[PDB]
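Example: 3-phosphoshikimate 1-carboxyvinyltransferase.
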Amino acid sequence: NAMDYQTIPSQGLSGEICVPGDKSISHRAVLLAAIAEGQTQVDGFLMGADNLAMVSALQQMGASIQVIEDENILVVEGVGMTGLQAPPEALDCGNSGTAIRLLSGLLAGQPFNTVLTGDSSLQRRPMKRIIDPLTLMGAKIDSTGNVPPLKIYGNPRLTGIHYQLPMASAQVKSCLLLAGLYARGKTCITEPAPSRDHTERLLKHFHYTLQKQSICVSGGGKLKANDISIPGDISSAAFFIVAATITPGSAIRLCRVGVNPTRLGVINLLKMMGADIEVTHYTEKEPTADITVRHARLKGIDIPPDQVPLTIDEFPVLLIAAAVAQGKTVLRDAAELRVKETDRIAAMVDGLQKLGIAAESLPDGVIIQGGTLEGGEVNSYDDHRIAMAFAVAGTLAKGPVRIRNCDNVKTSFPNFVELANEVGMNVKGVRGRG
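Written out as structure tokens, the predicted fold is:
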């Protein structure tokens, strides 16, 4: 039977907590380690449903991966570029868009056939953005309506291409870069606007040769095993940053959070809105830092377009900050929100309205009038970020907030409840319905 989250207001957040590992880096780290030469130890690996689904898919194809769940460690025995074997069944990517799209680039150049699918939500997510450029490289992929299930007819004779991406997308950049490694010649990717660069950084880590305003790679190289340490996901920290910002009497520090510039959006915008956030204890191994957050009053803002891409996954929780800020906040150029786990614009607008916030939808964003969150009930729409965003909303709401169906929070933040309660934000898992 289902599980829901139930909150009561917070009298202030307090403490030091280390959020778990970065989802984005975790996906790439395990996929690259799998086809490298040698043994790679991965610390800080995110033991969430999405990342574990990536592991599981790789295992269907003969990757040698040892999962040590309680310590967030993976031990990967590389099988080399050509070491994978044809799986017997369709690869279940669960709820993970990153897995299915990155796997597609890895499997495009294989000498075997693969069927990629997932859960209902994943079967509604768009794939044209990868199918077209892969097809230019020589890939043949079958799909009804440019959505999974995808059937890849492996082609070991893929050829490189130069390609400009229509919109900024790390997933597409990463997909092509992977297929690039198995393609004859150079593959050059040019972005109109920078997207997160984790792939590029891991490729350098595994000593694969990389060129550069666009970035290129030549096929036939080899990845060399090299131990990896994953920093904390700032997307997970985003929930505590917003909560401590909006909840009076709050003072907290978030240890070992990744601070890659292509991920600092939530922080940049909150600051524009009046936030009190201090980055210190800065270090390098992917950049990492300690984030200290204190309560501050906020003013609504017009979200500059250039920040949208770097903050796409943080709008759910940011919109909770806009809801309790003074004045109006307008989000634009965020039509990508509609095509995620769920339509995140529709889902936030509905939740906010149910909690008493004047929130109006736009095809590419929302208009929010800062106001006062009331207690009530909202639906997560099975989306992990919608669920946690509303759990953050509970800290300031006038009354309890019931968020329905929170089983998917583990897709990116398995220990969310435990850490929430530990810093003083009240959230309890309780028997759901249906």
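The longest strand covers residues 276-284.
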